Design a protein around this ligand. Structure first.
Ligand SMILES: O=C(O)c1ccc(-c2nn(C(=O)c3c(Cl)cccc3C(F)(F)F)c3ccc(Cl)cc23)c(OCC2CCCCC2)c1
Ligand SMILES: O=C(O)c1ccc(-c2nn(C(=O)c3c(Cl)cccc3C(F)(F)F)c3ccc(Cl)cc23)c(OCC2CCCCC2)c1
Lengths: 260, 269
């Protein structure tokens, strides 16, 4: 609750975030804007560029891309879980509430952090080694094309806030420590942690974006749109599963989606 | 370098050690010796009453957990160990020079060090008759732990065997604060990128521990050497520990936790 303490918490979370997520927004942005020789991605914009891309960096292409999304989402769940344990107080919570917070929080976080990998033309893949175009993703057949596009729609709006990794590290923590998740046993300790995270985010945004009016409020308003987009994602994903048999969901994602 | 620098480092680490860990050795020993009473778990019925009266957070039934007591206690060890890792990680940041290391090397040092540190610090909570749990609110007997069925009983006992020998050195919290730092700053962990600064810090921690032990146990002959020799018992039992855990997972079908819980505890299983 004191500034030094709030700045210390910000530094802690940023450092843990760097340790936990291999591909930061800062690195993604350097790749997307370029001007460098060594970091240029191979761009996948059609079927044949995809073929060449596998040789550089079976199933029907839409499915293969879906399985690529879910395999990375599972890895992201693992990275997010490691990050969560570094949030002060999280591992001391009731073990059931830890599961619950991760269960309902990972999806919102994956959307947030996916945006870091995206611009209006596509998304970085394979640790930034590839770039798959939005138009290619959107043109995937039957339900898959429309499954991909809303991730871009959110990302373009979220990215206009110009958050950097130091901002995102605290924002992600706030999302995880949401006391309103269904089935929480002890709301008060989660809310006490979140108030400290919210206080730290508030000061971080004031110091890092002093010219950005009410960025704190605008970012909390983004957490609202995240709740709606994750809801649409699950409903669409359920429909796809009840139509496509060639789709396995990783048992970790399978568990997260059950009862959700 | 100089005596004052080494004493300052000792005091800095001691002060941080107190801040980082919930139950110090000094407080634990007062409880173990009877100097009010912790709730005592000595059999199945006292365990049931103890979880119902006291809230032993690591041995409370989860959803999708084994109801078998031996498994529940085993997993409780793993859940507390997860908590200890974060405590050790926070302590590490207070060691002068540590946060300036390469971030990958900070991660590596903590990764390969926490097991040795958890064993070491567990000894502070243990005597030959049992172990303090829940910040000293409970005391679980060695006989109860050792009498758990199949491999679980034999998984518990080696921890007591080590602790009893380690505790004969009669280290206090000011000694342990430096010793634990020395363990973290081990230059021989696999995959370190820049060993030189890690050994430079460890050499300072070693000088500080050597002087600490001379001043705090002037009558304890070659205590510095005997404590470094305990790295032999520590490296060996962590090795044994890994083999034991493997047998349990490749044998026990009733160990299922919610996959998100499995992910949280993934480095300790
Ligand atoms: O690296 C990451 O951090 C990363 C993170 C996320 C995705 C991703 N997840 N995702 C989902 O639907 C999804 C979500 Cl958001 C949350 C949870 C579960 C899922 C799902 F299980 F259902 F999969 C996308 C849809 C559209 C798009 Cl463009 C991306 C995703 C991701 O994409 C990897 C590559 C996409 C292009 C082809 C090659 C692989 C990468
Ligand atoms: O408070 C602490 O600082 C504390 C510290 C350690 C333990 C502990 N760790 N441990 C391990 O096996 C272990 C080790 Cl040493 C190193 C690394 C990882 C593990 C493991 F992940 F595999 F778990 C025990 C075995 C036997 C016994 Cl008696 C204890 C431990 C500890 O136990 C708490 C339990 C509460 C419920 C009732 C039973 C004791 C508490």
């Amino acid at each position: 609750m004191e500034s030094a303490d709030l700045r210390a918490l910000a530094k802690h979370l940023y450092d843990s975030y760097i340790k936990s997520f291999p591909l930061t927004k800062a690195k993604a942005r350097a790749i997307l804007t370029g001007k460098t020789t060594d970091k240029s991605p191979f761009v996948i914009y059609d079927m044949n560029s995809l073929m060449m891309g596998e040789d550089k960096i079976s199933k029907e292409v839409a499915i293969r891309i879906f399985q690529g999304c879910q395999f990375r989402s599972v890895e992201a769940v693992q990275e997010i879980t490691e990050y969560a344990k570094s949030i002060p107080g999280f591992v001391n919570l009731d073990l059931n509430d830890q599961v619950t917070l991760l269960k309902y929080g990972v999806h919102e976080i994956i959307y947030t952090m996916l945006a870091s990998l995206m611009n209006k033309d596509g998304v970085l893949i394979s640790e930034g080694q590839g770039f798959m175009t939005r138009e290619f993703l959107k043109s995937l057949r039957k339900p898959f094309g429309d499954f991909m596009e809303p991730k871009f729609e959110f990302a373009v709006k979220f990215n206009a806030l110009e958050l950097d990794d130091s901002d995102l590290a605290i924002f992600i923590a706030v999302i995880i420590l949401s006391g309103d998740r269904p089935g929480l046993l002890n709301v008060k300790p989660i809310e006490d942690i979140q108030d400290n995270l919210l206080q730290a985010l508030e000061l971080q945004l004031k110091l890092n974006h002093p010219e950005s009016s009410q960025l704190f409020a605008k970012l909390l308003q983004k957490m609202t749109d995240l709740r709606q987009i994750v809801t649409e994602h699950v409903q669409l994903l359920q429909v796809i599963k009840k139509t496509e048999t060639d789709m396995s969901l990783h048992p970790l994602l399978q568990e997260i989606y059950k009862d959700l």
